[PDB]
Structures are given as structure tokens and as C-alpha cells.
């Protein structure tokens, strides 16, 4: 029941470039975007915002993933040769799936 948006980030630059806070076992239990690297893929996408909470990466829930593991999954999603994009399911609010 959260209000969510599926944002596709194409790999238009050599970096993804998002700073994320939080993760499991913290008071921000899913990663929240706190800033965006100018000139990176997330910036070029335009649809990712500071304050966006990442519910899923390519359909995979981040619930229960501690910060370092969530960061690892997102890094792998950006590096993969499977596809030239990442789909982030995001929400502006504090309701989780």
C-alpha cells in the first residue's frame, strides 16, 4: 500500500551516482536518496529525487538488507552486463511494502 513510482535509469554515464542513507536495522529501514552526483546516470535520468526511498531494485525487495548489502545490490545492478538500465521502485513517503 505505499504510493510508488517505477523509475528506469538508463546507463547513460559511467557512474550511477546516488548517495543513500539507511537500510535494515536502522530508523530509515530502506535506503533513502540524500544527494545525486551531477553528471552521472541518476542525474541524467531526472526522475530520481532526493528523498526517494528505494523499495525494490529490478524487482528485488531491499527489505531486510543492511546498508552495505543494499549498496552492493545497487552497484551490481549498475555494473551488470544483463541489461543497460536499472528499474528502481521508489516512494516519496515512509510507508513500506
Amino acid at each position: 500500500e505505499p504510493t510508488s513510482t517505477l523509475v528506469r535509469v538508463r546507463k547513460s554515464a559511467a557512474t550511477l551516482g546516488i548517495a543513500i542513507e539507511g537500510g535494515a536495522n536502522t530508523r530509515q529501514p530502506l535506503p533513502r536518496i540524500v544527494t545525486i552526483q551531477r553528471g552521472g546516470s541518476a542525474h541524467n535520468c531526472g526522475q530520481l529525487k532526493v528523498g526517494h526511498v528505494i523499495l525494490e531494485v529490478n524487482g528485488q525487495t531491499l527489505r531486510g538488507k543492511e546498508h552495505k548489502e543494499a549498496a552492493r545490490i545497487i552497484a551490481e545492478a549498475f555494473k551488470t552486463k544483463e541489461r543497460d538500465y536499472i528499474d528502481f521502485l521508489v516512494t516519496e513517503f515512509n510507508v513500506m511494502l
Partner: peptide, 7 residues
């Protein structure tokens, strides 16, 4: 709350 960059 931890914070880090994913480049």
C-alpha cells in the same frame, strides 16, 4: 544512520 555513495 549510515550513508554512502554508489558510483
Amino acid at each position: 544512520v549510515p550513508v554512502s555513495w554508489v558510483y
